[PDB]
Scaffold this active site. Structure first.
Site, PDB file in Angstrom:
ATOM      1  N   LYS A 176      -1.309  19.326  32.081  1.00 37.92           N
ATOM      2  CA  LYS A 176      -0.437  19.548  30.816  1.00 37.92           C
ATOM      3  C   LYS A 176       0.156  20.980  30.755  1.00 37.92           C
ATOM      4  N   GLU A 229      -7.275  30.507  26.455  1.00 31.52           N
ATOM      5  CA  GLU A 229      -7.252  29.700  27.704  1.00 31.52           C
ATOM      6  C   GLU A 229      -8.042  30.426  28.555  1.00 31.52           C
ATOM      7  N   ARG A 230      -8.068  29.719  29.789  1.00 30.51           N
ATOM      8  CA  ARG A 230      -8.696  30.344  30.549  1.00 30.51           C
ATOM      9  C   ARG A 230      -8.086  31.683  31.054  1.00 30.51           C
TER      10      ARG A 230
END
Lengths: 167, 466, 509, 467
Positions: free
Chosen positions: D154, D180-181
């Site tokens: 994604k 987010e990571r």
């Protein structure tokens, strides 16, 4: 509205949310002490039922309960804002709750600057202490009383149990 | 006693009543109101504060308004002088024709007929809609719950029922438009005027209207029902008159209640539905019977919530039903006017004793086939036009004939349906189907049966093309 | 309440009972504030649901008349204010500016410009807190009313005064469609039958400015804006505003209605409005309900919608046609309020995206779309051709029935299917395609009378445009006539036919 | 004005101010937390107490502690020096190269720009990728939400877009890695660094990075959103710029709001939400725009919880958008990347007008065929075949080719794909599918259409796939 004023003890508010009102109120106008004594008085001036127990009796109309319990009587010399706060706790039913406000209060001009540490037996005994200096020891000496096994014990005061507690 | 507006938080009005809390249901009249502002006392909170309910208009209300207790519930006009008249809940006209001139007043509540007060009479009355007689017998005092598609069938039907009945049965009707759409009442009005069974030149209408409309507080909407009940109790008991009590919508009541339970702070039962939903009803149904003097047979619109019945609310309702007409939208969609879910346009009642034994039996044959027919239908969704294993096709088709024959064109819906009226006098009906069972309609093809009155006319119509 | 003013500051003076003595009654001090909820201490004497006025200037409104304070939904900021702020009563609930100069105007929901056309003039102001009319005050809908969309006008033949639900999805062109309808009203406003002049009120409910901006731009393009209010509650809005917007709209359109005028309010959409309100209630800890929604929002609306009507002329002379929009999300009307709403209007208009995906704008699930009304909302005209068509689509659908079972079972139907397909072509109706009826029926007539079964389905459409230009040009006479006749006349038919045939012939050949 | 923290119930920091409360939203500096603990006034709780929010966490706080109002809401560094940097909320160097020395400061607040001050109707920004533009053409300066389950490639996909597009784009971009990571951000960083677009030699770049990672205490994640906005706004209008605004993930943002909603002493909502979600968004999204002064085409990545869209939050979301990219988990699940549900990824912005009818139509036929095609799919799925219609067969297959034709592999990420298959300039795109519409291709393979670019080559590949 106002601005925060709180005699030493001071408190947490809450059934002393009033106390704190007068910890700013009494304090301000500095009938701090007038009322400080008022309260004391009130305490037992309170304590007997009558036009007070009146409230309990739900069916007595608070409206006029104030005008009886406080009209003739609680204004007997409890008035300044003092009857008005009476008449407030009155409304706000905090009358049965009032002792605790006093409690809360009363550690106030004296006891306002109380004594705390939690200390064996009849522990602290709200007084006054100045943290820079020791005050502790002194006290202890004064007495060679209290109860310390029944009253606070060698487990706190010196671990009777602990030696057990390791295993 | 007097109250003070102390807080208005929406239509939950806390009135601190300045004096003695009398019983609940006391209608309090707000002073400082250039309206008939009834509050119904709702809870004695104590220290004369009541939680009360606003039913009347707001926005302007003084926090401090003055309330004067009517000390009792509302008294509202009751008695025959309501006929013609469109009264709101407060018994006040909304006929806009001015006064509703009963000079008898009533608390909108009424009591629940004792065990003896059952003059409940166990048998069918009729008003000629085929399907009804056939599936669901009629009751004297009974509550029939009519479910379905308002203004496309449910309402429509009601109106026809209204149409045939008031006239045909003497013993009047009451219509309580609970959260009624002013518009539909407008329309209805014009129909009523038109029909003239709302007699106004002689307010000798065969119908009383009580409305507690959409544009009114739930409290208001809720209570028109009780009111209406009170009134009808006049006609039954007092006037003997065998009221058809048309309710639209008890559901809208239900809604009013439900919101209210919450608003009352209070817990409502499942799904949010007021927990007393049933009791409101229950007691109310128990405020019905056929008395000795009359019968109040209730004809009830139920917005079939989410067209769901499983739905606890209708779940409850059922206990109180004496007939239920659950339309089948498929059927409505199948055109069929009447738009029935016949399997659930039901009455626990019906027996070869109760109805014709024939009636019953014929019906049983029908009920049967229809049950079965469905089963086959299932194959057909995956397996036919007008052909499968033909005997079996036959039953299908016949079921279709029956189906079609159930469709009874309706005059009031020469506009809606596009189709003119048909009323099928009962024998002609039974015979109609009975004959289908007898199956001669083979000689006579099927389709024409769709939307006819007596069975013959379809025959005529078929033949003219064959 | 039970803490505040039991605790100091607030309390701390009440004791004395000296603190304005108290007042805050036509004043308030913001008791607590956060987050657009000004608990305002005081204001004590208050009306119900008073709009009040802020020390931040701003309004909020005292809905919740509490015995101490006022739950004031502040219709905006909290970064202005800090507590104790003075709230001055206005002694007054909202009524909203209404007027006719709002026609031609985009205002915020305040009925104040945002249009950046400078300000509007406010002639009137008028209660939002104004109830619905009565039975007799209404004379029911008589009119037809053309969206300029055959399908619409036909299958939901709409009159005026009519409450009817528009329901359909996410920017699915539905709104485009809605616009197109609006575009249609232009011709009437360029017409002169007032009764055919429909004054448009586009209540933009929580619909983001950008979204408005193109759209308005579109309205500009249609210039039709001139008879149009755009009542604007965009997404940014303070919730009470978004919330407010319909009621506001409600005052103005009833006004028109009552000013003889036939007003149209497009509420787009109350789904959102409701959120805002609910949110508002809930924040007041005036708790939620089914679908988190507390329930007399329906009353709110029911009543709201009860305010939409077709007036008996003796009683208003006009209409407020309410075309509410609920924009379905996944067609979802399980959606509580839709369930409700379903129970409220006199039909509801179902849209089916799939048609849309097929290309077919419009989307419609006609089968589900309804004007129960229908005919009161119509004319002679349409019915004569349309009845059959509806039915025939019923048949078409019927062989789609037997597309839940099958693809072929009758010759007739192989034809009927053909016919059906034809009928479909017509129902493809461009967005930005406002019409007059004569066209609508016109275009229907050939095919529904079979003579377009005789042509490539794709080319039907082609025909139609062309055809239209043909008559427009040519049979302008006739167009005048059908229009005259307000119906399809035998003559018109016959002539139509004749034309049709010639056109048909030219198009087909 | 000063408060002392009176109650800490998590990072909902209750400060009782002992005197004056500045209005809500004032950024406060806690007197003690050198762990630069901005508290943002959230509520004036009453009696000079505010609810304020720690952005930060809390361990070690003595209930007591003195807080000194930073006297405003957040002031943040703004201007171009934020380009090529990692800023957090406060624009601190998570570049970790020292400050983001600006001139300009900002309240991270900004509001909705006037409606008239916007541009009213925008004009298509084509989206390159064939399937994408074709079915969802965008508007230059548009807000696109990419619904999609995160991390399914994604995220990869967005990057790839960036690759194609953000590269292709000049102007500037704002990148917000929210929630987010950090790990991925780390790589990405280096990748940009590497790219040198994250110029290692420009304080700027052409892109500013703003991060509000998951591992953060909420306020930080929450508020980085305003921040990012402020900057981008800065660039949009001020730098007049065509800004690209990348957000990953608004979902985490929204979530952050919702999470607090409870704690904020408010009611949460349905599903727990922030009930203010709408107002938050409405106002926020309206902070977003492409006005005249510049344009922000904002590509907003949307993790969609459990891909539930139905799920009210996404239900809301839709309003904010004007282009939605709805990714089909199933298609993605077919490995098929493109994975989108494009009959769900939408723009009304496709046009016979704007996009010309060819495209448009070609699409309408497509949308259509496919739309029909799904419908059966299920039936037939179990209901097998033939005692049927095979014209349908034709469409099915065709649909499938088309289906495959939407697919283009992750060109760049040979690490993930190993595969390239390019971008299709728009006419070639239209052409491509149109040709399939011409169905000549149909005796041909199916995966030829899979994961490629130009239909010509695909065709080439078809032949080739035909051995």
């Amino acid at each position: 509205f106002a601005k925060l004023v709180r005699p030493p003890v001071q408190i947490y508010g809450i059934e002393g949310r009033y106390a704190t009102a007068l910890y700013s109120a009494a304090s301000k106008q500095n009938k701090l002490e007038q009322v400080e004594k008022e309260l004391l008085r009130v305490g037992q001036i309170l304590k007997e039922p009558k036009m007070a127990a009146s409230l309990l009796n739900p069916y007595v109309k608070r409206s006029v309960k104030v005008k009886s319990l406080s009209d003739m009587t609680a204004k007997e010399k409890f008035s300044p804002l003092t009857s008005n706060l009476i008449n407030l706790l009155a409304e706000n039913g905090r009358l049965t709750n009032t002792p605790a406000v006093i409690s809360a209060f009363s550690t106030m001009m004296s006891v306002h600057r109380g004594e705390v540490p939690c200390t064996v037996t009849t522990a602290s005994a709200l007084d006054e202490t100045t943290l820079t200096e020791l005050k502790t020891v002194l006290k202890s000496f004064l007495s060679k009383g209290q109860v310390l096994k029944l009253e606070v014990k060698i487990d706190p005061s010196i671990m009777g149990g602990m030696i057990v507690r390791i295993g | 006693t007097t109250g003070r507006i102390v807080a208005v938080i929406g239509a939950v009005v806390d009135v601190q009543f300045d004096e003695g809390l009398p019983p609940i249901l006391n209608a309090l009249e707000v002073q400082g109101r250039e309206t008939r502002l009834v509050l119904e006392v709702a809870q004695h909170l104590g220290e004369s504060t009541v939680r009360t309910i606003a039913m009347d208009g707001t926005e302007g209300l003084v926090r401090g308004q003055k309330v004067l207790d009517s000390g009792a519930p509302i008294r509202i006009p009751v008695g025959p002088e309501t006929l013609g008249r469109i009264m709101n809940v407060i018994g006040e006209p909304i006929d806009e024709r001015g006064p509703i001139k009963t000079k008898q007043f009533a608390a909108i509540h009424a009591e629940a007929p004792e065990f003896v007060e059952m003059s409940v009479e166990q048998e069918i009355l009729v008003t000629g809609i085929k399907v009804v007689d056939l599936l669901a017998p009629y009751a004297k005092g009974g509550k029939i719950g009519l479910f379905g598609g308002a203004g496309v069938g449910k309402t429509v039907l009601i109106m026809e029922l209204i149409n045939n009945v008031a006239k045909a049965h003497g013993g009047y009707s009451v219509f309580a438009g609970v959260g009624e759409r002013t518009r539909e009442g407008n329309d209805l009005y014009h129909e009523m005027i038109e029909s003239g069974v709302i007699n106004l030149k002689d307010a000798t209408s065969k119908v009383a209207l009580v409305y507690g409309q959409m544009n009114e507080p739930p409290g208001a909407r809720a209570r028109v029902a009780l009111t209406g009940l009170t009134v009808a109790e006049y006609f039954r008991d007092q006037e003997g008159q065998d009221v058809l009590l048309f309710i639209d919508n008890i559901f809208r009541f239900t809604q009013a209640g439900s919101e209210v339970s919450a608003l009352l702070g209070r817990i409502p039962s499942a799904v949010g539905y007021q927990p007393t939903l049933a009791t409101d009803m229950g007691t109310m149904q128990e405020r019905i019977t056929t008395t000795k003097k009359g019968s109040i047979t209730s004809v009830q619109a139920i917005y079939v919530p989410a067209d769901d019945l499983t739905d606890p609310a209708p779940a409850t309702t059922f206990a109180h039903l004496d007939a239920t007409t659950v339309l089948s939208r498929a059927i409505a969609e199948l055109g069929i006017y009447p738009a029935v879910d016949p399997l659930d346009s039901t009455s626990r009642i019906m027996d070869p004793n109760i109805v014709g034994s024939e009636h019953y039996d014929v019906a049983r044959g029908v009920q049967k086939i229809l049950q079965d027919y469905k089963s086959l239908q299932d194959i057909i969704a995956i397996l036919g036009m007008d052909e499968l294993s033909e005997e079996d096709k036959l039953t299908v088709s016949r079921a279709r004939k029956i189906q079609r024959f159930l469709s009874q064109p309706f005059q009031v819906a020469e506009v809606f349906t596009g189709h003119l009226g048909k009323l099928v006098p009962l024998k002609e009906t039974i015979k109609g189907f009975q004959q289908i069972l007898a199956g001669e309609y083979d000689h006579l093809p099927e389709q024409a049966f769709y939307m006819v009155g007596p069975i013959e006319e379809a025959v005529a119509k078929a033949d003219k093309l064959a | 309440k039970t803490g505040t003013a039991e605790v100091s500051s607030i309390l701390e003076e009440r004791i004395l009972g000296a603190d304005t003595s108290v007042d805050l009654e036509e004043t308030g001090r913001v008791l607590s504030i956060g987050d657009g909820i000004a608990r305002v201490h005081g204001l004590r004497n208050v009306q119900a649901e008073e709009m009040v006025e802020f020390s931040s200037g701003l309004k909020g409104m005292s809905l919740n008349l509490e015995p101490d304070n006022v739950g004031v939904v502040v219709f905006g900021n909290d970064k202005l204010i800090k507590e104790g702020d003075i709230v001055k009563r206005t002694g007054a609930i909202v009524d909203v500016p209404v007027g006719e100069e709002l026609l031609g105007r985009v205002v915020d929901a305040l009925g104040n410009a945002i249009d950046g056309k400078g300000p509007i003039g406010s002639k009137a102001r008028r209660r939002v807190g104004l109830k619905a009319p009565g039975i007799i005050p209404r004379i029911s809908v008589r009119e037809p009313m053309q969206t300029g969309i055959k399908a619409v006008d036909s299958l939901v033949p709409i009159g005026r005064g009519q409450r009817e639900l528009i329901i359909g999805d996410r920017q699915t062109g539905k709104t485009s469609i809605a616009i197109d309808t609006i575009i249609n009203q232009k011709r009437f406003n360029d017409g002169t039958d007032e009764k055919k002049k429909l004054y448009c009120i586009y209540v933009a409910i929580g619909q983001k400015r950008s979204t408005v901006a193109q759209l308005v731009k579109r309205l500009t393009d249609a210039d039709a804006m001139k008879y149009t209010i755009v009542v604007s509650a965009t997404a940014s809005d303070a919730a009470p505003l978004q919330y407010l917007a319909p009621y506001s709209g409600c005052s103005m359109g009833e006004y028109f209605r009552d000013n003889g005028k036939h007003a149209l309010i497009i509420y787009d959409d109350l789904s959102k409005q409701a959120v805002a309100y609910r949110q508002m209630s809930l924040l007041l800890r005036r708790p939620p309900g089914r679908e988190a929604y507390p329930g007399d929002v329906f009353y709110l609306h029911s009543r709201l919608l009860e305010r939409a009507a077709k007036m008996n002329d003796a009683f208003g002379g006009g209409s407020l046609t309410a075309l509410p929009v609920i924009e379905t999300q996944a067609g979802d009307v399980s959606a509580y309020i839709p369930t409700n709403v379903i129970s409220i209007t006199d039909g509801q208009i179902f849209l089916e995206t799939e048609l849309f995906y097929k290309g077919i704008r419009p989307a419609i699930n006609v089968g589900l779309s309804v004007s129960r009304v229908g005919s009161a909302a119509q004319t002679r005209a349409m019915k004569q051709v349309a009845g059959t068509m509806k039915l025939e689509l019923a048949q078409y659908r019927e062989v789609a029935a037997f597309a839940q079972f099958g693809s072929d079972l009758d010759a007739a139907t192989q034809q009927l299917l053909s016919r059906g397909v034809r009928l479909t072509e017509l129902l493809k109706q461009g967005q930005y395609s406002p019409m007059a009826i004569e066209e609508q029926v016109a275009v229907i007539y050939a095919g529904v009378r079979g003579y377009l079964d005789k042509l490539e389905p794709s080319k039907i459409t082609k025909f139609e445009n062309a055809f239209l230009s043909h008559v427009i040009s040519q049979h302008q006479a006739l167009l005048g006539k059908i229009r005259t006749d307000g119906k399809i006349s035998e003559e018109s038919d016959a002539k139509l036919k004749e034309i049709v045939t010639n056109f048909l012939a030219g198009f087909e050949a």
